[PDB]
Design a protein around this ligand. Structure first.
Ligand SMILES: O=C(O)C(=O)Nc1sc2c(c1C(=O)O)CCNC2
Ligand SMILES: [Cl-]
Ligand SMILES: [Cl-]
Ligand SMILES: [Cl-]
Ligand SMILES: [Cl-]
Ligand SMILES: [Cl-]
Length: 299
């Protein structure tokens, strides 16, 4: 087994996932969020305790107010960036697509549903019907649903985003994980990795494009889990060396760029499981990807 597998077993056998996770919260970076906290930005933040750091926040190219609750997670060694953002609010959906446009993102990963636990965790920021496109008047963008591929626990949407100022259009892919509970974990490593490899294979995360946008309700819990596993698998892939990947150290590196990434100890535990199971594909057993697809019951 791998070094992370033995560590996983030691932490399980001694029941210290809560302790290990609190250790991560204690060591995590603390940087100012002065812009997030400005009075004029109060209604641009979904949660008062979830803010982007000033040093890594995404600036909208607006002259009025450039603030969006969104962070550039720039993983230097992995050579991959992400934008993590909260679920857009009814007044920031225009800001959200403005950011996608200005950052040249081609992929949006959504890990939440619009309604969770009786609560509206995310605005309805993309059109649900081909014939009912959305126009964002404040930012001059048009958004059309082109097609969608609905599977049992996730949906992939092809969207067309148009800058109405210039009439340039871009295809944006929407990867929507629909069965991941807020503050919870996916039903299995298999269905998580099946989704993650769908995102990887789409070409959304190609460096020819801007960073993939990843969001949940707050942009930290499920978003941090997805991003930690993706980066750890990428690092393992570049090195073909599972042993060189220190998962906790990678999470602490990500938390330099946005607070609160991974919100429960069970999500941390799930991260390990996803990485340990994904390593089988990375290290040359490609049949495992077909096993994941079968186990995830996406039909
Ligand atoms: O959606 C996620 O995965 C996530 O991080 N959610 C978060 S993080 C977070 C909250 C929520 C929420 O959804 O209520 C509420 C206030 N504290 C922090
Ligand atoms: Cl202000
Ligand atoms: Cl939804
Ligand atoms: Cl509900
Ligand atoms: Cl909302
Ligand atoms: Cl935290």
């Amino acid at each position: 087994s791998m070094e992370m597998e033995k560590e996983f077993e030691q932490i399980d056998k001694s029941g210290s996932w809560a302790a290990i996770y609190q250790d991560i919260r204690h060591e995590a970076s603390d940087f100012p969020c002065r812009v997030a906290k400005l009075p004029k930005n109060k209604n641009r933040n979904r949660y008062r305790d979830v803010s982007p750091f000033d040093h890594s926040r995404i600036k909208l190219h607006q002259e009025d107010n450039d603030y969006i609750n969104a962070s550039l997670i720039k993983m230097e060694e992995a050579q991959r960036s992400y934008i993590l953002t909260q679920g857009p609010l009814p007044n920031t959906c225009g800001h959200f697509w403005e950011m996608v446009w200005e950052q040249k993102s081609r992929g949006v990963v959504m890990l939440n549903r619009v309604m969770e636990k009786g609560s509206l965790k995310c605005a309805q920021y993309w059109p649900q019907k081909e014939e009912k496109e959305m126009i964002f008047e404040d930012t001059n963008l048009k958004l059309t649903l082109i097609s969608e591929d609905i599977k049992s626990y996730y949906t992939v949407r092809q969207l067309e985003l148009e800058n109405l100022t210039t009439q340039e259009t871009r295809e944006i892919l929407h990867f929507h994980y629909t069965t991941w509970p807020d503050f919870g974990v996916p039903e299995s490593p298999a269905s998580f990795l099946n989704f993650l490899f769908k995102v990887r294979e789409s070409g959304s995360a190609s460096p020819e494009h801007g960073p993939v946008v990843v969001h949940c309700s707050a942009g930290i819990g499920r978003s941090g889990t997805f991003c930690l596993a993706d980066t750890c698998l990428l690092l393992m892939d570049k090195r073909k060396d599972p042993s060189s990947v220190d998962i906790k150290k990678v999470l602490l590196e990500m938390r330099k760029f946005r607070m609160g990434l991974i919100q429960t100890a069970d999500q941390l535990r799930f991260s390990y499981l996803a990485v340990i199971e994904g390593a089988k594909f990375i290290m040359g057993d490609s049949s495992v990807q077909d096993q994941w697809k079968e186990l995830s019951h996406e039909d």
